[PDB]
């Protein structure tokens, strides 16, 4: 084995590495609405900044559990980001929805990956995936369904452009 | 030849003296829709202080083009400064229309003056037009389409308004 | 066309599109690198940070050139950002080598993206590679020839490790 | 029943007081190691200052273990303090991998520690140990297995005497 490792299992070992790309991808989606919340005929810049900013917030999620590998003794392998459903998302409702989904679909691997830790009696890895990883996904799902109630109360026009200046806005 | 003269060509002088009258044309068109947006019967006033500052760059970029015939060694002629096409503007999105494509145009005839200058391997005047100019015109464009998305998403009446206070503001 | 478009042909587009690919492999390729390092049997932490660092400059690179695609009136179209080649990266020497051979591919397709650019008479987007992507592939060339250069002069082992905490560390 | 208690095993509290002899124990390593590498002989003294603190940190884990004790309503028994197996340490890299051997000790008895506190459906217990020892054990046998790797690429001699500067201080 590893130097490091110890009540590591290889199941656990594969499981980090699938989420890895998971985090990857999400990364990659959140950047791709960033850059079209950004186009001349959308042109919503505070919602393209906070797509901008959960695209970077993905890619610290996939490297701390890069890092968490390596301290474990694991080894990453990467694959393939794949590039995302859509070029371009839509309504500001839509692209909420769009994330919602996605949120909920890292969260439920990421249940499931705790699940796998649970299995092989990984202690730390629970407490490391229950403190860094599952409080913030209930926090993001929380966000993103405040965030699609508002748009439906304000509806489409004006009421998008006062939500990208009220709330969305820093 | 005047003393500060090398590797500039008569074209090249002249194509600046064009240059430097349309600047001086698109100052004006700016001036008259600051005060457009001035009157009491529009009475949009950060609409009205965003022309008045596009129409002191303006005027500057003219300034600077003399400047810079000076620094090579042409003669500076001046003309006449035409009256803008039009004595009232219509509304918001429509005065950004028409902005646009005064914006294009001077792009375009910037791009004419740039050709200029690299037919007559004027290695020193492109580049000087590339950084004070061509950048420029990118942005603006960019600035002014997204104005345009933006008072078609937000509409007539409140959202002009709202426009002014939130993006026209300073 | 779109709002903005003006001078800009789809040949270099699409050439966009393309280099934004390759810089976001770039990207990938250093943070592989980064968790290389970053391995408990490895364990040269300022050579993680180094290509942590690389590898979130080349991330910027890819947005900067979509923004630019933005600007520009083009439309972003991402593909999937493939794997690197290798899953290790051997010595710190045969790892900046590699970075060598990286660094000179993305410049030869930089220097190729400026080729479109100058077929069709695009003066800004060529000043913008110039000033944005060239300069620093240069200065990126020269940093790695130096790491090279020293270390083949330290050697294996305390030389490497010595390089660690002087050079590479900031 | 001790006013505090509840939902606390009898066999939990068994397990604390087995597990504060460890830490206790391990602090006696980690303080014959510092005072080996202040040796004349041996005179790496950044090595010395790495083992005096983490002889001061297990000895910091034993009584945060004594003190969850009194607050669970356990009762703590002491036991003696074996002295460490050997009398001097050898080189660095040695050192280094002798401590690896021993964090791990530590790490698996407070794995069976948190599986005993997982019986009896200690939940807060098992909280404690996850945040305040199972991820302060993955950090230092992450910490250790670094030290172990750099000492064997930098070598003996110079290397060790480098690395007592750079890293260790
Ligand atoms: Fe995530
Ligand atoms: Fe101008
Ligand atoms: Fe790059
Ligand atoms: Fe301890
Ligand atoms: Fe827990
Ligand atoms: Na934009
Ligand atoms: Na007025
Ligand atoms: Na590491
Ligand atoms: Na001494």
Redesign the interface.
């Known amino acids: 084995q ?3 490792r ?2 590591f299992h290889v199941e656990s070992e594969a499981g980090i590495n699938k989420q890895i790309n998971m985090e ?1 991808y999400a990364s ?1 989606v959140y ?2 609405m960033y ?2 919340f ?6 919503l ?1 505070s919602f393209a900044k906070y797509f901008k900013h959960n695209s970077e917030e993905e ?1 610290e999620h996939a ?1 701390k559990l ?2 968490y ?5 694991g ?10 459903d859509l ?1 371009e998302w839509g309504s500001p409702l839509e692209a909420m929805q769009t994330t919602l989904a996605l949120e909920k679909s890292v969260n439920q691997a990421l249940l499931d990956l705790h699940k796998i830790a649970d299995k092989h ?1 990984d ?2 890895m ?3 995936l229950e403190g860094e990883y599952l409080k913030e996904q209930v926090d993001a799902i929380e966000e993103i369904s405040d965030h699609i109630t508002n748009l439906k109360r304000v509806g489409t ?2 009421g ?3 939500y990208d ?1 009220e709330t969305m806005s820093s």
Chains 1, 2, 3 share one sequence.
């Not at 950004?38 to 042109?43: H, M, N, Q």
């Not at 080894?75 to 995302?84: A, C, E, N, S, T």
């Open positions: 590893t130097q490091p110890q009540n990857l990659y950047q791709s850059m079209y950004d186009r001349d005929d959308v042109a810049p890619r490297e890069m890092k590998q390596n301290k474990r003794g080894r990453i392998v990467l694959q393939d980001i794949q590039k995302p070029d009696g202690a730390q629970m407490d490391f026009g004006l998008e452009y006062m200046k």
